[PDB]
Amino acid sequence: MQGDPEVIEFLNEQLTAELTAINQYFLHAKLQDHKGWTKLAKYTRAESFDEMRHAEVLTDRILLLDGLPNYQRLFHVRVGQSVTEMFQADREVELEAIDRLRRGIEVMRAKHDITSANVFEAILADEEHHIDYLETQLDLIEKLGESLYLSTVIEQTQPDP
Amino acid sequence: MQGDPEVIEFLNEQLTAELTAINQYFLHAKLQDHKGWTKLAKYTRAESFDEMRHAEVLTDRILLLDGLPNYQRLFHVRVGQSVTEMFQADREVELEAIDRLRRGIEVMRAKHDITSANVFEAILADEEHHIDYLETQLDLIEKLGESLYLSTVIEQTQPDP
Amino acid sequence: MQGDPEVIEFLNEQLTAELTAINQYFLHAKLQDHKGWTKLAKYTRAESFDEMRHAEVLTDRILLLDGLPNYQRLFHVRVGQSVTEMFQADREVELEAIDRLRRGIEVMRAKHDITSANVFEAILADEEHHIDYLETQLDLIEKLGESLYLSTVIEQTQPDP
Amino acid sequence: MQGDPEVIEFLNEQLTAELTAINQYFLHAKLQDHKGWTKLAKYTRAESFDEMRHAEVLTDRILLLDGLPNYQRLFHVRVGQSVTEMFQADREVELEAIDRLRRGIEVMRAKHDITSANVFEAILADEEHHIDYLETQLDLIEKLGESLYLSTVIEQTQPDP
Amino acid sequence: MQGDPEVIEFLNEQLTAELTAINQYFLHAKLQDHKGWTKLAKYTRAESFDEMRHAEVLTDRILLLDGLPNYQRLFHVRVGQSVTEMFQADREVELEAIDRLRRGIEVMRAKHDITSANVFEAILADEEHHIDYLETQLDLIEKLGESLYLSTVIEQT
Amino acid sequence: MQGDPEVIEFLNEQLTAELTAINQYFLHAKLQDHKGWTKLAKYTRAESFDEMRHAEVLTDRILLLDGLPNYQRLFHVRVGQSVTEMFQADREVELEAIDRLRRGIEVMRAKHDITSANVFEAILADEEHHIDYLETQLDLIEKLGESLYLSTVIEQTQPDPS
Ligand code: HEM
Ligand code: HEM
Ligand code: HEM
Ligand SMILES: [Fe+2]
Ligand SMILES: [Fe+2]
Ligand SMILES: [Fe+2]
Ligand SMILES: [Fe+2]
């Protein structure tokens, strides 16, 4: 087996994207936890781990076709300081990823490579779920009031580690 | 073994400081608990116990060098009535302690007494953690709003004992 | 409720006394343990803990009447080198305390404040028991012989942590 | 608290180095596992996890001093095809790291910041252990014979997930 | 890795000292146990085992720097007949060891080798504890009375 | 009772020999373990512990006769680099010990001291078994091939405590 060049290019793009996402999510997890906001920290940690698993699967697949994984690149990382900005950054990233996934699935399945298409389909479902949750939380913050919102996710524990 | 005079002087200063801190923390624990604020009471109580253990370790050490522990002194104790004032008092105390610890560690380790230096290093780490937590809580109170902050740490139980 | 000034004065004096006692007992516990006499260390440590509990109860009561606890003042602390001197110091302290307790209970119960009177009565019973035990041990030391007495409370641990 | 600029610079450099190491180790884990050499895969995977933990600790510390972690930069990643080349790459990386650690510990502890010095000391111990193991395995491969060496770490699983 | 010569010299001296201490402590354990004083035999055995562990750690460290451990040389061993003499011998040994440890830690940490300095720091803490206990027991023997002291550690079994 | 002088001399010599053996075996255990060879390390550690127990028994006996144990003297310690040299050193030591044990047992039992003779007999049995195992392993190394031999006792831990 030898996957064509274009399939490998798409797989590499998606791999780099998932890596960037891992980095962003972990940085945000630490930043949030340090300030007192706890449950947000727990949620964001879980999401980072999920993106890790994604990266693993893509790496294996791109190995099995006689490819050269690219663990040397990275797209721009964004960082915020309030809550609204964090959520907006994450929403932007997920949108871009979804568009790429769709285009890639089309081109792939038009060339008789089915397994890669299935991998992309799974990734796509998950990214859609995630963007949905982000949008919901953003709408709440808009409605209640930033102080009100924050006042529900603070507990008494040790900030630093 | 006979630790030099200056080492003993520094150990005695630190001992007196830890004693003062114990007293302040327990008074604040009672005052907070009596008004309804519960979780604050639990936290402050635990912190007082920790400072107790600190004092014990310092006493044992200063005994092992043929010294004369000083259980007769006390630095000025501060007391507030609101929350912000309590937190600010505690922050002031911790700052003073940290500065003393650093100067003492330097002078000690410049005279071939290593064990005392290690004791001071441990104490220093812990005091740093504590000051960090204090600053975080103070920032929250500044942001949310005093009443809207308190409204998260009140339960239905027996005030007095 | 607002307890009169005189009731609060008596409560404050008793509080300061129990604090001084806590300090003295703990210092003696360390000093005894460091020399090898363990079985005395255990007893004295337990007694210190009991006096701690005393202080806590008194503080709560003096809070419930709209008072101002006084955690800033200490009486004189005594320290002895041999054993007989330790026991004699403790006996002196307990005697002073008992006299104060009796006078206070009388004046209180002559003014329609019954709960404080009950608190004092409990404290009085306990401090009397303690003075009794002290006197007994002192009589033994007088009879047997100092060295022949010590020879019964030494074990093979000889610590100083 | 506000750590000086130079302390933060050293912490940031060490953080970037640990990140690069994580990436290299995991790529090597996958590459080895895919070819049949199992036990080497297990070992290298565990080492990657350890470096992950290192990175986390450094990030927290650099946060506590009011710093700006740098999750956006990577050094050069090396990849080899045979086994000897893998081991040699890892050895090179560890050497660079050790030199940096020593210089940094000196400069730090010459400026009254002790906790960062302790962090570096722990990291240094661990990196030394690791370089030792690498050198040992390389010497064996040199002695036995490459094929006769590999023949000891192959099992009947031959997966690639 | 290539540890300098002077670091290795200090490590070797400390190793030889710990070995001598092991030998002395075990001989004393047997001698005491044989006469009836059991409760002292137990303590002394435990201390010998601790010194064994010390020796092991030092040997490994001096191996990791490309060194040549020296398991061929011993210092002088002392032996006493009564009890006070045993305690005094042990006290002397520990004092000497402590002085060496301090000087070595200084010179080491002045040359960027940190892990060895940490090893020495741990050893130093432990030796200090031990010398303390020795001094305490000696003071008791001085106070109570030799026979009246012994009479508390004999056992019919 | 008081054992004669010559009995005590023989007991002291044997004690010194067992001490030297303890030292050699532990040094070899560390050296082997540090290079990767594991199972050899485990075996050699066990052997060192056995020699320790030997020394303990001998010292107790020499005390019970009103003697003066000699914890101050050591014979020469040998050290190698490869495997063959290690095994050959150990074989040499055991041979010497055997000869001494036999001569001593004879002289002892010719003087009405039976318990010491029994002690020596036990020690002798054990030393014989040990020398046997050494010779067997040496013959294997001769037959298979040094590298092809080592390739069977290496695992993926490669430690060196500190
Ligand atoms: C900056 C910090 C971290 C980075 C850059 C990072 C990155 C990675 C990468 C690149 C992988 C391999 C991708 C793959 O196998 O497909 C991975 C796997 C993994 N990492 Fe990390 N990681 C970080 C922190 C952590 C931490 C602190 C933990 C603590 C447990 C952790 C746990 C894991 C796990 C469990 C996996 C494998 C998940 C699975 O097998 O399903 N990661 N991570
Ligand atoms: C100079 C003043 C004091 C000193 C030196 C002191 C010392 C100590 C020490 C060393 C302990 C050790 C407990 C442990 O190791 O677990 C202790 C326990 C304790 N302290 Fe104090 N203390 C002081 C005053 C107080 C005060 C003012 C209070 C009450 C507000 C208090 C309440 C307690 C209690 C209740 C315990 C035991 C907790 C339990 O048994 O659950 N102490 N103290
Ligand atoms: C370099 C390391 C060691 C050395 C030099 C050493 C040396 C010795 C010596 C000289 C004796 C008894 C000597 C006599 O009876 O006069 C002995 C006995 C003993 N030591 Fe060690 N030892 C070492 C390691 C250890 C370790 C690590 C342990 C425990 C984990 C240990 C436990 C014992 C035991 C159990 C005995 C008695 C053996 C038996 O009853 O058969 N030794 N050792
Ligand atoms: Fe993803
Ligand atoms: Fe403290
Ligand atoms: Fe009392
Ligand atoms: Fe690392």
Ligand SMILES: [Fe+2]
């Ligand atoms: Fe030692």
Ligand SMILES: [Fe+2]
């Ligand atoms: Fe033997």
